[PDB]
Amino acid sequence: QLSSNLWAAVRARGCQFLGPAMQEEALKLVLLALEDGSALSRKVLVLFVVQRLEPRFPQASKTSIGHVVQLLYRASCFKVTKRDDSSLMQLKEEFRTYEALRREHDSQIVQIAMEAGLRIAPDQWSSLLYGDQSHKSHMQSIIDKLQTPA
Amino acid sequence: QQLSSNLWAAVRARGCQFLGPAMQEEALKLVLLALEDGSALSRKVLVLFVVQRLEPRFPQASKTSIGHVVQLLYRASCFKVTKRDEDSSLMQLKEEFRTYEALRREHDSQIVQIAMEAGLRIAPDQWSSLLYGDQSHKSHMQSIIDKLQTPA
Numbered sequence: 094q095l096s097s098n099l100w101a102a103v104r105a106r107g108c109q110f111l112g113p114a115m116q117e118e119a120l121k122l123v124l125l126a127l128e129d130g131s132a133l134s135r136k137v138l139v140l141f142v143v144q145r146l147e148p149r150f151p152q153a154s155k156t157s158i159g160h161v162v163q164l165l166y167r168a169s170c171f172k173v174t175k176r177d178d179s180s181l182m183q184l185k186e187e188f189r190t191y192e193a194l195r196r197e198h199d200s201q202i203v204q205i206a207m208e209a210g211l212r213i214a215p216d217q218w219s220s221l222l223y224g225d226q227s228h229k230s231h232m233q234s235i236i237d238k239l240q241t242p243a
Numbered sequence: 244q245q246l247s248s249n250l251w252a253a254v255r256a257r258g259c260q261f262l263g264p265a266m267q268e269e270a271l272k273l274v275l276l277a278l279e280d281g282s283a284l285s286r287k288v289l290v291l292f293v294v295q296r297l298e299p300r301f302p303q304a305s306k307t308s309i310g311h312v313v314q315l316l317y318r319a320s321c322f323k324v325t326k327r328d329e330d331s332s333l334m335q336l337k338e339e340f341r342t343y344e345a346l347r348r349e350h351d352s353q354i355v356q357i358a359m360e361a362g363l364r365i366a367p368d369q370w371s372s373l374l375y376g377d378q379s380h381k382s383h384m385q386s387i388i389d390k391l392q393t394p395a
């Protein structure tokens with residue numbers, strides 16, 4: 094019930110979580126393209142990612158990867174250069190490591206759960222987002238930052 | 244060949260590469276695919292974009308050789324370069340070269356310029372063979388040579 098309701102809330106907001114392994118690889122590919130400050134259109138960023146993902150993850154599509162990009166967009170990860178032509182995205186300087194990018198990504202899904210009234214604990218979050226229990230403290234610190242400080 | 248061997252040696256000596264007519268055609272189309280909308284990519288990311296799509300079709304493709312193809316386009320003044328502080332330089336295809344024909348004209352002209360630098364005299368028929376593997380690009384090659392040789 095809980096997971097189903099979380100992923101519905103994510104999809105309701107134009108976003109997607111592709112499962113722990115696929116999301117991790119999708120994010121590492123976004124990072125590979127943008128960590129040096131390259132400025133890519135959605136077209137080109139998605140082309141870059143889908144092409145490399147599709148062999149291992151056949152569910153990779155322009156639509157599903159676009160939705161992962163939208164999650165990062167909603168999280169304010171990008172500097173956007175607007176045009177008369179397709180707008181460009183760069184990763185903001187503070188988010189050009191996997192740890193940082195993953196922190197904003199994960200925080201955005203927690204905020205979505207808060208927006209939808211879902212009460213999820215660190216252990217549950219670790220399973221949901223990583224398929225393991227090695228990110229409990231990572232998830233606890235995300236939640237603390239979204240609540241009144243001590 | 245003598246002229247062919249010498250031409251390609253001259254190109255490679257300048258940090259540039261021509262992958263063969265079929266392969267170079269595909270490589271340039273993939274550069275176009277990444278850059279035709281005005282995206283600004285580092286050499287790193289442009290090479291990655293190209294090799295990831297080229298290598299499955301042409302298994303001899305490497306980051307090193309594709310890097311040399313990008314250098315040929317750079318040498319040919321095809322890019323608008325930007326550089327923010329310490330971050331990597333970014334390449335955009337100049338607006339005038341965002342079609343295959345326009346991009347090939349500048350690429351092909353640069354290779355002709357290299358031939359001239361090296362003192363190689365190659366006729367349009369030979370050029371058509373060299374750059375396209377056919378005899379259907381002789382007039383294209385003549386126009387390129389005339390533009391390099393003769394003021395308009």
Ligand SMILES: [Cl-]
Pocket residue numbers: 342343344345
């Ligand atoms: Cl064309």
Ligand SMILES: [Cl-]
Pocket residue numbers: 379380381382383384
């Ligand atoms: Cl012709």
Ligand SMILES: [Cl-]
Pocket residue numbers: 378379380381382383
């Ligand atoms: Cl002809």
Ligand SMILES: [Cl-]
Pocket residue numbers: 382383386
């Ligand atoms: Cl022509």
Ligand SMILES: [Cl-]
Pocket residue numbers: 380383
């Ligand atoms: Cl032509």
Ligand SMILES: [Zn+2]
Pocket residue numbers: 344383
């Ligand atoms: Zn032509």
